[PDB]
C-alpha cells in the first residue's frame, strides 16, 4: 500500500490492486515610567561623576522625583 | 544454509564404484544419449507395469495407442513423478534437438539462440510441466518476466520481432528449478521404483 492507500494484498480481494489517484480531488502609567527613567538617568549620572556617598545621590534623586511630580499635576 | 559435513556428493559417490567410467564426448552426443536413455527408462517403466498400449513417443509424448477400458485407465494413469520425468525429458529433448538442428547444418547459430530462448521461455507451452508440478509456474513466471525485460532492452531501436536469443537468465532459472527438484525426484522415483520392484509396504 503506497501512501497507506492500497490493499494489504492483491491476493484476497481478487482485484488487480491498481490504486490510481483520483483526478477529481494608560497615561498615568506612562508618566510613572518616564519618572522612573529620569530617576535611573540621575542615578547613572551620580555613579559617573562624584557620588560614592549615598546621601547626595539619594537627595538629588529625591529632588528630581519631586520635580517630576510637580510637572505631572 | 548448506550442510557443512556434506562430503558425499552424487557423482563423486559413483566414480568410486567399478560400474561408472570416465570419458570425454561431445555435448551433443551426451544430450542425444540422455534422450535415448531417458526414452529407454521411461519405456521400461511403462512396460514393466504392463502399459504396452501407451506408446511413449520419441519426443516423450505419452499417447494411448487405442481407446481404453477403465482398468486400462487405472493402471495407465501415473503420478506427478513419472509425468514430471516425462516433462523434464521433453524440455531437455527440445534443447538437444535445437542443438542438433544447428549441428546438422540446417539452422543458423542466431536462429539456434532464438530457438533456445524460445524453449526456455515457452516451457509452459511447448512442454507441459506446469500440469504435474505447479510451482514450476513460479519459474515460468520468472522466465516470462525475464522475457519482458530482455525484449525491451534488446529491442530499443528494433521494435518488435523474433531474433532475440540472450537466453542466459532464463537458463539460470530452469537450472535453479532443477537444483530444487533433484532430491524431490530422487525421493519420488525412489518410492515408485521400490514399489515396482520391492512392492507396496
Amino acid at each position: 500500500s503506497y501512501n497507506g492507500i492500497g490493499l494489504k494484498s492483491a491476493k484476497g480481494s481478487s482485484t488487480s490492486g491498481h490504486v490510481q489517484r483520483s483526478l477529481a480531488s494608560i497615561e498615568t502609567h506612562m508618566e510613572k515610567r518616564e519618572i522612573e527613567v529620569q530617576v535611573s538617568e540621575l542615578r547613572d549620572r551620580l555613579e559617573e561623576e562624584e557620588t560614592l556617598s549615598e546621601e547626595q545621590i539619594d537627595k538629588k534623586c529625591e529632588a528630581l522625583r519631586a520635580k517630576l511630580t510637580n510637572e505631572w499635576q | 544454509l548448506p550442510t557443512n559435513h556434506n562430503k558425499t556428493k552424487l557423482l563423486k559417490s559413483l566414480k568410486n564404484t567399478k560400474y561408472f567410467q570416465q570419458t570425454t564426448i561431445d555435448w551433443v552426443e551426451a544430450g542425444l544419449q540422455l534422450c535415448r536413455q531417458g526414452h529407454n527408462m521411461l519405456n521400461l517403466l511403462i512396460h514393466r507395469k504392463g502399459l504396452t498400449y501407451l506408446h511413449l513417443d520419441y519426443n516423450f509424448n505419452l499417447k494411448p495407442t487405442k481407446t481404453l477400458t477403465t482398468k486400462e485407465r487405472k493402471k495407465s494413469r501415473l503420478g506427478n513423478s513419472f509425468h514430471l520425468m516425462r516433462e523434464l525429458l521433453k524440455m531437455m529433448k527440445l534443447i538437444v534437438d535445437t542443438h542438433v538442428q544447428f549441428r546438422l547444418g540446417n539452422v543458423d547459430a542466431f536462429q539456434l539462440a532464438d530457438g533456445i530462448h524460445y524453449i526456455l521461455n515457452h516451457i509452459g507451452q511447448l512442454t507441459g510441466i506446469y500440469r504435474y508440478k505447479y510451482k514450476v509456474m513460479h519459474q515460468i513466471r520468472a522466465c516470462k518476466d525475464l522475457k519482458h525485460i530482455i525484449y525491451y532492452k534488446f529491442n530499443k531501436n528494433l521494435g518488435k520481432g523474433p531474433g532475440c536469443g540472450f537466453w542466459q537468465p532464463a537458463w539460470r532459472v530452469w537450472l535453479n528449478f532443477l537444483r530444487g527438484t533433484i532430491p524431490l525426484l530422487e525421493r519420488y522415483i525412489g518410492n515408485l521404483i521400490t514399489r515396482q520392484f520391492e512392492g507396496r509396504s
Binding site: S1, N3, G4, I5, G6, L7, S13, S14, T15, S16, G17, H18, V19, Q20, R21, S22, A24, S25 | -
Partner: protein
C-alpha cells in the same frame, strides 16, 4: 479507495480508485447502478407524478369524464407505487388485499426458497425498475 488509517476517523474524500475487476482488454462494461433510478430520485418524482395524478383526477371529476389511460402515458412507469398499477386487470380483486407486505415478508418462515424480492409486489407496486436498456 482512501487512507485506511484516516478512513476510520473522518469522512475522507474519494482520493484514490482501486481497480475493481481488470481485464486485459479496455472493455468499459456498463454497470447496473447507472440503469436504476435511485430512491431520492424516485420519491421526488413519485410526489410529482402523484400530484399530477390527483390533479388530473380532480379535474376529470370536475370534467365528469372517466380518466382513460391514454393521457398518462409518459408518466406510466414513474412513481412509487407505479401509475401502471391503477389500470391493471385485477384492481377490483386487489381492492380487498390488505396486509400483503408482511404476508410476503413472513414467507421466509414457511417457504424453503423465498423470492429475494420479499419487499416488493408487482401486483400492488408494479415493476420498480427496468433493465431492458442495460
Amino acid at each position: 479507495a482512501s487512507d485506511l488509517s484516516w478512513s476510520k476517523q473522518t469522512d475522507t474524500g474519494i482520493t484514490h480508485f482501486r481497480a475493481g475487476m481488470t481485464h486485459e482488454d479496455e472493455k468499459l462494461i456498463p454497470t447496473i447502478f447507472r440503469y436504476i433510478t435511485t430512491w431520492e430520485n424516485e420519491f421526488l418524482d413519485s410526489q410529482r407524478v402523484w400530484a399530477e395524478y390527483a390533479t388530473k383526477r380532480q379535474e376529470a371529476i370536475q370534467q365528469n369524464r372517466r380518466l382513460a389511460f391514454e393521457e398518462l402515458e409518459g408518466s406510466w412507469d414513474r412513481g412509487i407505487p407505479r401509475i401502471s398499477t391503477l389500470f391493471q386487470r385485477d384492481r377490483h380483486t386487489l381492492a380487498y388485499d390488505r396486509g400483503h407486505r408482511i404476508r410476503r415478508e413472513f414467507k421466509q418462515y414457511s417457504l424453503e426458497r423465498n423470492s429475494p424480492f420479499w419487499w416488493t409486489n408487482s401486483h400492488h407496486d408494479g415493476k420498480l425498475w427496468n433493465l431492458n436498456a442495460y
